[PDB]
Design an enzyme around this catalytic site. Structure first.
Site, mmCIF file in Angstrom:
data_model
loop_
_atom_site.group_PDB
_atom_site.id
_atom_site.type_symbol
_atom_site.label_atom_id
_atom_site.label_comp_id
_atom_site.label_asym_id
_atom_site.label_seq_id
_atom_site.Cartn_x
_atom_site.Cartn_y
_atom_site.Cartn_z
ATOM 1 N N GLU B 31 0.877 -1.166 0.000
ATOM 2 C CA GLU B 31 0.000 0.000 0.000
ATOM 3 C C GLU B 31 0.909 1.209 0.000
ATOM 4 O O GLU B 31 2.106 1.077 0.290
ATOM 5 C CB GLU B 31 -0.892 0.042 1.235
ATOM 6 N N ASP B 77 -0.011 -7.640 -0.301
ATOM 7 C CA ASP B 77 0.077 -7.164 1.074
ATOM 8 C C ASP B 77 -1.198 -6.441 1.483
ATOM 9 O O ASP B 77 -1.334 -5.233 1.287
ATOM 10 C CB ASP B 77 1.284 -6.240 1.244
HETATM 11 N N1 LIG Z 1 -7.538 2.205 5.940
HETATM 12 C C1 LIG Z 1 -6.543 2.549 6.788
HETATM 13 N N2 LIG Z 1 -6.772 3.382 7.833
HETATM 14 C C2 LIG Z 1 -5.800 3.734 8.695
HETATM 15 N N3 LIG Z 1 -4.533 3.289 8.588
HETATM 16 C C3 LIG Z 1 -4.171 2.453 7.583
HETATM 17 C C4 LIG Z 1 -5.172 2.022 6.603
HETATM 18 N N4 LIG Z 1 -4.541 1.208 5.734
HETATM 19 C C5 LIG Z 1 -3.243 1.127 6.120
HETATM 20 N N5 LIG Z 1 -3.035 1.868 7.225
HETATM 21 C C6 LIG Z 1 -1.749 2.065 7.936
HETATM 22 C C7 LIG Z 1 -1.671 1.298 9.244
HETATM 23 C C8 LIG Z 1 -0.236 0.821 9.227
HETATM 24 O O1 LIG Z 1 0.550 1.846 9.835
HETATM 25 C C9 LIG Z 1 0.152 0.704 7.765
HETATM 26 C C10 LIG Z 1 -0.270 -0.635 7.211
HETATM 27 O O2 LIG Z 1 0.856 -1.443 6.951
HETATM 28 P P1 LIG Z 1 1.114 -2.763 7.831
HETATM 29 O O3 LIG Z 1 -0.155 -3.308 8.431
HETATM 30 O O4 LIG Z 1 2.292 -2.444 8.719
HETATM 31 O O5 LIG Z 1 1.540 -3.760 6.662
HETATM 32 P P2 LIG Z 1 3.071 -4.032 6.276
HETATM 33 O O6 LIG Z 1 3.132 -4.150 4.775
HETATM 34 O O7 LIG Z 1 3.973 -3.069 7.016
HETATM 35 O O8 LIG Z 1 3.215 -5.536 6.846
HETATM 36 P P3 LIG Z 1 3.575 -5.900 8.378
HETATM 37 O O9 LIG Z 1 3.586 -4.653 9.237
HETATM 38 O O10 LIG Z 1 2.455 -6.850 8.728
HETATM 39 O O11 LIG Z 1 4.943 -6.526 8.153
HETATM 40 O O12 LIG Z 1 -0.654 1.659 7.092
#
Ligand SMILES: Nc1ncnc2c1ncn2[C@H]1C[C@H](O)[C@@H](COP(=O)(O)OP(=O)(O)OP(=O)(O)O)O1
Ligand SMILES: Nc1ncnc2c1ncn2[C@H]1C[C@H](O)[C@@H](COP(=O)(O)OP(=O)(O)OP(=O)(O)O)O1
Ligand SMILES: [Mg+2]
Ligand SMILES: [Mg+2]
Lengths: 193, 194
Positions: B31, B77
């Protein structure tokens, strides 16, 4: 025959649609105003409400489309594509910064416009001052709470929208400074062809 | 083979997706976190930014869809249908009142849900809150440190609730994310070979 009435707040879109609905006997489609929970909030604090308001209104448009696009005889107070005008207004008045406006237009074209028409779009062209006075005697008391700048900026953008006409509406222009009686006569005439 | 990796913040989705890609060659779709202009703002002041944040995110998802649509093999992801989880969290935590919540979902149903990707497998990286918070500290983003623990608790609860309810009927495959990475990849590759 699918009719829309277009113009700013206080242009007299409701008075005009009602008269038409009486004469031709069609149904008027109206956006939520009394049912909108953000209405008073919106006019007390634009900066804090603009996004909430906008998402609510975009949902309502989406619903109206569901029912409308299977009906032959309809009258519309405002069209479905006029919500960016109110955003563009807040943008101009610095309640919404470049980033927000870019996110919104990116949002509008790539999420909202995935829903994808009238026979005539009547444009009630009117000066700011006249619309302001029609808010005073015909409109909602909440609308009385923000300054003139808002209405000026709205009228400006409404004409802008009409001049650019990016969706190619079959527009018809009526001078709304005239009294309702004349406006109706000019509208009924145009409709007769 | 269309793969999606599912879990709370700090479940280790990025690590896992990277490993799978390494073995298989499939493109990972992250994302926007870095190009997200609301990211730091969001954790600094939720109340003022949740709606701005949400609008950006759904916009981003829709772009990812409109670039991964035709690809035979993908690794996602996170899926495009998990944004309401974050909103629900903020609702439990009183960052958003009942109306705003209803407005958000009313919009989601009528606009977003009307439309398409079909994942062969949605891999739930299931973790305790405690393990997640430490992974946030290890390899997470520096902005994620700005809010209290209670945010991550509720988010893990809502993530568990999402899986148990399975509204969209995802083909879920649970992995014990407490396990070291090497072992997780073993379990995943074995499942993938079917
Ligand atoms: N709809 C949303 N509303 C609020 N925050 C969001 C939304 N979508 C994503 N985020 C934020 C929350 C987290 O800080 C980040 C999401 O990435 P995260 O869950 O850490 O996946 P990642 O790719 O880093 O894998 P991981 O952390 O599981 O290794 O972005
Ligand atoms: N996208 C939007 N953002 C903010 N406010 C909106 C939006 N759409 C509508 N409104 C507000 C402004 C007005 O107070 C009301 C919209 O109706 P309005 O333009 O006044 O038509 P109307 O049916 O009252 O006819 P008229 O005012 O022309 O007689 O709701
Ligand atoms: Mg009005
Ligand atoms: Mg992370």
């Amino acid at each position: 025959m699918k009719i829309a009435i277009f113009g700013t707040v206080g242009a007299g879109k409701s008075t005009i649609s009602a008269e038409i609905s009486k004469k031709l006997g069609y149904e008027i489609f109206k956006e939520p105003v009394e049912e909108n929970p953000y209405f008073e909030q919106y006019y007390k604090d634009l900066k804090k409400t603009v996004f909430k308001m906008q998402i609510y209104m975009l949902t309502a448009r989406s619903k109206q489309l569901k029912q409308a696009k299977n009906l032959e005889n309809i009258i519309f107070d405002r069209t479905l594509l006029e919500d960016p005008i109110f955003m563009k207004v807040n943008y101009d008045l610095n309640n919404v910064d470049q980033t927000d406006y870019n996110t919104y237009i990116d949002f509008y074209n790539n999420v909202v416009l995935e829903n994808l028409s009238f026979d005539i779009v009547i444009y009630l062209r009117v000066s700011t001052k006249t619309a302001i006075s029609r808010i005073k005697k015909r409109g909602r008391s909440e609308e009385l709470l923000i300054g003139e700048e808002y209405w000026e900026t709205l009228n400006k953008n409404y004409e802008e929208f009409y001049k650019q006409n990016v969706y190619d509406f079959p527009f018809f222009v009526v001078d709304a400074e005239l009294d309702v009686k004349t406006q109706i006569e000019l509208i009924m005439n145009k409709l007769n062809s």
